[PDB]
Amino acid sequence: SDRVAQLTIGNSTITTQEAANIIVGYGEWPSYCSDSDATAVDKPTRPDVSVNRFYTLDTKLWEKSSKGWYWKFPDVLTETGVFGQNAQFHYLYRSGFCIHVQCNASKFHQGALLVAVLPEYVIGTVAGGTGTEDTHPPYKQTQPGADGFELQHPYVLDAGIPISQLTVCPHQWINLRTNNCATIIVPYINALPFDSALNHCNFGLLVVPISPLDYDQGATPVIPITITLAPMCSEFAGLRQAVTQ
């Protein structure tokens, strides 16, 4: 009655029988932009059901040696479905998200993933190793698209900050003996009312194993982690031709 759940939005429904409640980031639900916070004058388009629905984008395999991965929002969706089209045809975009990370095993497997949302997740580089070279991460590392990207140094989140404190951000854990999914609702976070879905990623989603995956020889060894997410309260403005970047 807290372990069981159904998430229905658009023409999509998700079920889980081993949930751990739901986190609503910073304690607030997604909402549309008010007439006082807004600044752009054109009437926005709010496609509703055609874009606020669940999209299943990627599956990673959790191995005994995995380091962890991250995805950037709204980047993961800019090329998918009606949402993508809207993000490409409009200069301005804004929306919240319902993120549902899935991972099931058996009562004989073990391990724990930390699933967190970090706003303005700026990636850093190792500065040539010695720290004398002012290098920058390439586009494919900053905006990895649906495939996501693997962390090189999880302990410092590839940005010189401690993953040990990442729990100060909206998060849940997928501890195999307890649950098989994490659900996080995120409101629109930014210092502007609307922004470009292409040039700016509002937050990053991190899925990192903190207690390594383990099991005895003979138990199913392929343990996938699937990422499903749904935009919420999507709004677009500043219409022109489609642009991919």
Partner 1 sequence: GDRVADVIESSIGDSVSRALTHALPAPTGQNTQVSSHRLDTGKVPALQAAEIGASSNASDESMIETRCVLNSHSTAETTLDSFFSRAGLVGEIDLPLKGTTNPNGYANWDIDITGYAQMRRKVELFTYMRFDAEFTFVACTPTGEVVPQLLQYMFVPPGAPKPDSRESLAWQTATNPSVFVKLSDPPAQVSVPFMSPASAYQWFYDGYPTFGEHKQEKDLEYGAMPNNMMGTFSVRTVGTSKSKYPLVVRIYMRMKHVRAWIPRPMRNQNYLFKANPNYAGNSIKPTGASRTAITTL
Partner 2 sequence: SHENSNSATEGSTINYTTINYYKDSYAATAGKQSLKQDPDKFANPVKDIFTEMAAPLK
By CB under 8 A, is residue 27 in contact with partner 2? yes
Distance in Å, CB of 17 to partner 2, minimum: 8
Which of 79, 156, 210, 238 touches partner 1 by CB under 8 A?
A: 156
Residues 163-202: x/- map of binding to partner 2 (CB under 8 A)? -----x-x-------x------x-----------------
If you ran DSSP here, which 8-state letter would residue 1 be given?
A: -
Pair 158, 151: CB distance under 8 Å: yes
Of residues 27 and 218, the one with the C-beta less far from partner 1 = 27
Residues 6+ apart with CB under 8 A from 131: none
Cα distance between residue 185 and residue 117, in whole Å: 10
By CB under 8 A, is residue 76 in contact with partner 1? no
Cα distance between residue 102 and residue 116, in whole Å: 14
Cα distance between residue 121 and residue 112, in whole Å: 22
By CB under 8 A, is residue 4 in contact with partner 1? yes
Which of 3, 64, 140, 153 touches partner 2 by CB under 8 A?
A: 3
By CB under 8 A, is residue 241 in contact with partner 1? no
Q: Report residue 245 CA to chain centroid gap.
A: 20
By CB under 8 A, is residue 24 in contact with partner 2? yes
Cα distance between residue 79 and residue 53, in whole Å: 15
Cα distance between residue 238 and residue 222, in whole Å: 45
By CB under 8 A, is residue 212 in contact with partner 1? no
Which of 104, 146, 171, 226 touches partner 1 by CB under 8 A?
A: 171
Of residues 30 and 148, the one with the C-beta less far from partner 2 = 30
User: 143: closest CA among 172, 113, 123?
Assistant: 123
Tokens of 41: 């004058």
Which of 7, 14, 16, 20 touches partner 2 by CB under 8 A?
A: 20
> Which residues here bind partner 2, judged by CB under 8 A?
1-4, 20-27, 168, 170, 178, 185
